[PDB]
């Protein structure tokens, strides 16, 4: 008889949040494997790329890239994408040290979501097409070179 280890991880993460260590909270949950706990954490904190190390930001963006393929997570993905754009505009295109492959996956997956799903009902940010056009520009990726 022992607790599911994911809840011990969650407890460690909640303590980290209590003391303001968002980076450590993410490091714990992103490592615990469990997708539903990653979503649970993101739902609680909101977009948190401004409080993360490059290493943890890259782990989080890897999840966002995968989440973009799921229409139930579109709101979350747009919110994080918007924050990412704002931060790369402010702190520099390469501030987070995201590799070109991941940059490309994020754009490709966001463009795909944009093409197939409608903006969530409560979404109030830029049109999804504006996010992907602007992010592609900052990252110097030509969206029209993706094949249709």
Author numbering: 717 to 864
What's in the article?
The crystal belonged to the space group P212121, with one SPR2 molecule in the asymmetric unit, and a solvent content of 35% (calculated using the complete SPR2 649–864 construct, thus representing a lower limit for the solvent content if the construct was degraded). Selenium sites were identified and used to phase the structure, yielding clear, interpretable electron density (Final 2mFo-DFc electron density shown in Fig 3B), for which residues 717–849 (which includes the construct’s carboxy-terminal residue) were modeled. SPR2 residues 717–849 form a right-handed α-solenoid helix-turn-helix structure, composed of seven conserved α-helices (α1-α7). Six of the seven α-helices form anti-parallel helix-turn-helix pairs (α2-α3, α4-α5, and α6-α7) that pack against one another. Of these repeats, the SPR2 C-terminal domain helix-turn-helix motifs are structurally most similar to FANC repeats, as the helices are relatively straight, and lack a canonical kink present in the first helix (helix A) of a HEAT repeat, or the additional N-terminal helix (helix H1) of an ARM repeat. Collectively, conservation mapping suggests that the domain face formed by α1, α3, α5, and the α6-α7 loop is likely to constitute a functional surface, potentially for protein-protein interactions, mediated by both hydrophobic and electrostatic interactions. On the conserved face of the domain, charge is partitioned, with a basic patch localized to the α1-α3 region. The domain fold is similar to, yet structurally distinct from the C-terminal domain of Ge-1 (an mRNA decapping complex factor involved in P-body localization) and, surprisingly, the C-terminal domain of the katanin p80 regulatory subunit. Based on these differences, we do not anticipate that SPR2 engages katanin p60 using a p80-binding mode.
